[PDB]
Amino acid sequence: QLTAAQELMIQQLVAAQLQCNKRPKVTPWPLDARQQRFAHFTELAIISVQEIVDFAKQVPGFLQLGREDQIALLKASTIEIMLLETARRYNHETECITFLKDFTYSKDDFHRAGLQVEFINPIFEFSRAMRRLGLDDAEYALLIAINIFSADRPNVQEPGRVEALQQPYVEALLSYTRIKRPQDQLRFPRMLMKLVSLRTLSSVHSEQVFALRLQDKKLPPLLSEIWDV
Amino acid sequence: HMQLTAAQELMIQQLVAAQLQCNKRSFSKVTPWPLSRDARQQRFAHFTELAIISVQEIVDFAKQVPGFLQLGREDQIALLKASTIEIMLLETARRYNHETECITFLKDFTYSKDDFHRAGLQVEFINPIFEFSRAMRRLGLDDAEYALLIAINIFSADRPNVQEPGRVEALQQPYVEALLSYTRIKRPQDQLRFPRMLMKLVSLRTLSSVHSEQVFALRLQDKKLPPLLSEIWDV
Amino acid sequence: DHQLLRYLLDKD
Amino acid sequence: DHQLLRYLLDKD
Numbered sequence: 001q002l003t004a005a006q007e008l009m010i011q012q013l014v015a016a017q018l019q020c021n022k023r024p025k026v027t028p029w030p031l032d033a034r035q036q037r038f039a040h041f042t043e044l045a046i047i048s049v050q051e052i053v054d055f056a057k058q059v060p061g062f063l064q065l066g067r068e069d070q071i072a073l074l075k076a077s078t079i080e081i082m083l084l085e086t087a088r089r090y091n092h093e094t095e096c097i098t099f100l101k102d103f104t105y106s107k108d109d110f111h112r113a114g115l116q117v118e119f120i121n122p123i124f125e126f127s128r129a130m131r132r133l134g135l136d137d138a139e140y141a142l143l144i145a146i147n148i149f150s151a152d153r154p155n156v157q158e159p160g161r162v163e164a165l166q167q168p169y170v171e172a173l174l175s176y177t178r179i180k181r182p183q184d185q186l187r188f189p190r191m192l193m194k195l196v197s198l199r200t201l202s203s204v205h206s207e208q209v210f211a212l213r214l215q216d217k218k219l220p221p222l223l224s225e226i227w228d229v
Numbered sequence: 230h231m232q233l234t235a236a237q238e239l240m241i242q243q244l245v246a247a248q249l250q251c252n253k254r255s256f257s258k259v260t261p262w263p264l265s266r267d268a269r270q271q272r273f274a275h276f277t278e279l280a281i282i283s284v285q286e287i288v289d290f291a292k293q294v295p296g297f298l299q300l301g302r303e304d305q306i307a308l309l310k311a312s313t314i315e316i317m318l319l320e321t322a323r324r325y326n327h328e329t330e331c332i333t334f335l336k337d338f339t340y341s342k343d344d345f346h347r348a349g350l351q352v353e354f355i356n357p358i359f360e361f362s363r364a365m366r367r368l369g370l371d372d373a374e375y376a377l378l379i380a381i382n383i384f385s386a387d388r389p390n391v392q393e394p395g396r397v398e399a400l401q402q403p404y405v406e407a408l409l410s411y412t413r414i415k416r417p418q419d420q421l422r423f424p425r426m427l428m429k430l431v432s433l434r435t436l437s438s439v440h441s442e443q444v445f446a447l448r449l450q451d452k453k454l455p456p457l458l459s460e461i462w463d464v
Numbered sequence: 465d466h467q468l469l470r471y472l473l474d475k476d
Numbered sequence: 477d478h479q480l481l482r483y484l485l486d487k488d
């Protein structure tokens with residue numbers, strides 16, 4: 001028993017998000033060698049940032065925000081939404097993440113690009129754990145919508161409005177989980193707890209970025225504006 | 230859906246009573262507040278000494294949460310090191326006056342943003358503290374909900390250097406369930422109260438990261454933490 | 465500031 | 477490691 005709207009709105013979210021997963025050329029992976037790998041990643045990041053914004057514009061409500069809050073919400077949730085997408089494309093038998101249509105990367109490939117274990121491991125711990133919860137399309141879609149409308153992001157001008165926008169997505173997730181598995185009531189909490197983990201991941205990601213500042217690696221100006229100190 | 234089980238009702242009263250207790254033993258003396266480069270360092274000492282008092286109360290209360298000491302001593306360390314700053318921020322919110330925007334740390338002494346600033350703290354930390362304290366008051370938790378939320382925050386399998394995540398996540402369940410049943414009963418018409426409360430755990434986690442940066446920014450400024458705090462927050 | 469987001473938002 | 481903390485936990 002989801003309302004007629006909820007069921008539809010959820011289909012439109014999943015549609016939107018699929019259309020974004022399907023809707024490009026990057027610096028091919030090496031076979032200097034270290035730097036070509038790093039660049040390769042920063043270009044994957046640039047591409048996902050683009051899908052994420054493309055998705056956001058289609059999340060109902062999002063464009064009711066002023067432009068600066070749109071900016072503020074996306075600046076904060078970008079890396080967090082990324083890690084969700086990574087987690088979602090993690091193959092457990094192979095232990096590799098598959099990125100566009102074909103590409104596969106191991107906990108070691110990440111090491112070759114220049115990332116550090118302090119950041120690399122927790123990403124895989126999170127991908128593993130995200131697999132235990134076993135989310136379907138609808139849940140990832142709502143969870144992402146919920147992450148976007150976080151009234152507590154730095155520099156948000158209309159916190160009240162953002163929370164009111166988040167509210168319906170929380171309701172829909174709550175019901176959905178009460179029906180898909182009326183068995184486990186703790187499934188809803190446990191999903192929200194992942195949002196908590198994402199904040200810590202975002203923080204670890206920033207350290208990873210600061211790290212590269214010394215290890216003579218830097219990101220394109222466009223990503224730099226989103227993630228630098 | 231109209232009434233708590235006696236096991237849950239009991240669990241809640243023990244936490245509430247434990248918290249009340251640890252806060253009384255907290256009543257039973259720090260560097261005074263300066264009414265100068267020494268004054269600058271003294272205000273900081275003042276804050277750090279209030280912080281030491283808080284940590285002690287927090288450890289004391291965590292020891293009284295059922296199941297906490299049944300954990301590996303090492304995981305006890307791990308959970309507290311992560312927890313302490315978040316639980317402090319919850320208790321700071323609990324002392325926040327929304328009308329004049331200050332926090333009462335003792336009895337009749339009130340601290341404002343400028344007071345925090347005169348103790349060497351930076352606005353990028355200060356404002357997020359007041360922001361969160363403000364948001365918390367909108368939520369208006371009672372004794373039972375505060376006590377449960379803190380129990381739940383302590384038992385986060387999420388934390389760094391936790392050796393037995395599964396034990397930790399197993400302890401947290403009954404407290405999560407209790408909070409869930411408690412809010413449905415006391416506030417049946419607000420279906421989102423439980424979710425909003427968990428959402429606060431998300432905020433606290435960012436706030437923890439902001440505090441670390443404050444701690445780091447104090448190093449580059451010649452201000453070091455006293456032994457207990459250092460033990461907890463330095464790297 | 466945040467030209468990547470501003471550009472992507474204006475795009476279309 | 478974590479000496480003063482290890483104390484607080486041990487009291488009583």
Ligand SMILES: CN(c1ccc(C(O)(C(F)(F)F)C(F)(F)F)cc1)S(=O)(=O)c1ccccc1
Pocket residue numbers: 038041042043044045046048082083085086115123205208209212219223227
């Ligand atoms: C979350 N991960 C990640 C994100 C950003 C960076 C970086 O920000 C840095 F290494 F600097 F931290 C950079 F620069 F590579 F993009 C590095 C790693 S990821 O590998 O799973 C991923 C990459 C692309 C797209 C989607 C997910």
Ligand SMILES: CN(c1ccc(C(O)(C(F)(F)F)C(F)(F)F)cc1)S(=O)(=O)c1ccccc1
Pocket residue numbers: 276277279280281283317318321350358440443444447454458
């Ligand atoms: C959360 N805040 C805080 C916590 C820790 C510190 C510090 O850790 C540092 F400034 F270094 F960041 C220190 F050292 F003062 F305690 C500074 C401020 S508080 O002002 O609300 C508060 C102070 C005292 C007691 C309870 C709460």
Ligand SMILES: [Ca+2]
Pocket residue numbers: 017020051052055081085
């Ligand atoms: Ca997406």
Ligand SMILES: [Ca+2]
Pocket residue numbers: 104105106109
């Ligand atoms: Ca490979």
Ligand SMILES: [Ca+2]
Pocket residue numbers: 248251286287290320
């Ligand atoms: Ca306490």
Ligand SMILES: [Ca+2]
Pocket residue numbers: 330
């Ligand atoms: Ca104000």
Ligand SMILES: [Ca+2]
Pocket residue numbers: 262338339340344
């Ligand atoms: Ca004062």
Ligand SMILES: [Ca+2]
Pocket residue numbers: 329330331341342343
């Ligand atoms: Ca003020």
Ligand SMILES: [Ca+2]
Pocket residue numbers: 341343344
């Ligand atoms: Ca004053």
